[PDB]
């Protein structure tokens, strides 16, 4: 059963959560290929592991920059959680280590790129296509939430498309293991639940609100709340109003009214029946949850495969040096990394 599967998953997770893997590789074991992405977190570089010939996505954070951005605890959460989790729709953390200047998380590389690029280019996904992806996120949140983990940054930019056309969630920079409520203002403007904007204590229900934003954006081609500036986005989110494209099915609009629900006693994923209110919704009637988990469903889209190290699905970024100071920076802050 679902209860039994999650109980074994928790036993596996807790063993790693309580005794985290540390210092499992070194920078000199990898050949630098190209920058795949950048942000305030630092950068993600395509690398080749010489001993295996495998390609990986190496997330590199500058310790001093993490400290200035007040992201120490968040970065420790990201690495501690990633090394402990195991689910088909989560990107794997293969190695981690640090040096005098930087923190490194060597992740599974998905040459298929981010769902974001495909969604923007194609424009929108049909409902069966959006449902296929939505089902993987529902199962992933059922898994994460069962481990007391809140994800907090769901968006197409963080959903990688694998060689089989399935999803892999990446970027655990705001994930946190919390049993009670939490208060940090974090996430992406378009995806913030009203309780975050309003500075309330919040829980895992923010991930279910974010799922509503994602399904809408996938099926419409644009988010339910957009504007030129974040403040204007926040005004739309808290207004209690949402408009649907005329091509949205009645079942899709009903599911979205229940996910994009300001009232926490009414938001799907947050009620007595939990995730089953979503899994059992009419929009998901054709979804075979077990076949999705087992990856037996034919994917609606397979990204063009041009090799294990090809980067055609990624934008180009200015290449910067990976500098390693001769002096250890922020040793105490990142001691457990």
């Amino acid at each position: 059963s679902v209860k039994e599967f999650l109980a074994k998953a928790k036993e596996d997770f807790l063993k790693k959560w309580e005794n985290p893997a540390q210092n499992t590789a070194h920078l000199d074991q990898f050949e630098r290929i190209k920058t795949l992405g950048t942000g305030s977190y630092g950068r993600v570089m395509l690398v080749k592991h010489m001993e295996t010939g495998n390609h990986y996505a190496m997330k590199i954070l500058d310790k001093q920059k993490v400290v200035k951005l007040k992201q120490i605890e968040h970065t420790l959460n990201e690495k501690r959680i990633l090394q402990a989790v195991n689910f088909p729709f989560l990107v794997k953390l293969e190695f981690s280590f640090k040096d005098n200047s930087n923190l490194y998380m060597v992740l599974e590389y998905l040459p298929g790129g981010e769902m974001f690029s495909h969604l923007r280019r194609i424009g929108r996904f049909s409902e069966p296509h959006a449902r296929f992806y939505a089902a993987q996120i529902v199962l992933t949140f059922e898994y994460l939430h069962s481990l007391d983990l809140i994800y907090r940054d769901l968006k197409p930019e963080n959903l990688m498309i694998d060689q089989q056309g399935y999803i892999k969630v990446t970027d655990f920079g705001f994930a946190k293991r919390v049993k009670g409520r939490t208060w940090t203002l974090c996430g992406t403007p378009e995806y913030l639940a009203p309780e975050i904007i309003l500075s309330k204590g919040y829980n895992k229900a923010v991930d279910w609100w974010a799922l509503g934003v994602l399904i809408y954006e996938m099926a419409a081609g644009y988010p339910p709340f957009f504007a030129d500036q974040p403040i204007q986005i926040y005004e739309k989110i808290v207004s209690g109003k949402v408009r649907f494209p005329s091509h949205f099915s009645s079942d899709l609009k009903d599911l979205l009214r229940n996910l994009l629900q300001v009232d926490l006693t009414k938001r799907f994923g947050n009620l007595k029946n939990g995730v089953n209110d979503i899994k059992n919704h009419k929009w998901f009637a054709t979804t075979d949850w077990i076949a999705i988990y087992q990856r037996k469903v034919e994917a609606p889209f397979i990204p063009k495969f041009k090799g294990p190290g090809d980067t055609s699905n990624f934008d180009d970024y200015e290449e910067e040096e990976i500098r390693v100071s001769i002096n250890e920076k922020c040793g105490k802050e990142f001691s457990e990394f």
Binding site: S40, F116, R120, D153, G173, F174, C186, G187, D228, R243
Partner: peptide, 19 residues
């Protein structure tokens, strides 16, 4: 159209997390 309004907006590229 809503699509034209989105495409003309400044938020069609990758979106950054808040600070």
């Amino acid at each position: 159209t809503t699509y034209a309004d989105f495409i003309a907006s400044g938020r069609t590229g990758r979106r950054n997390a808040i600070h």
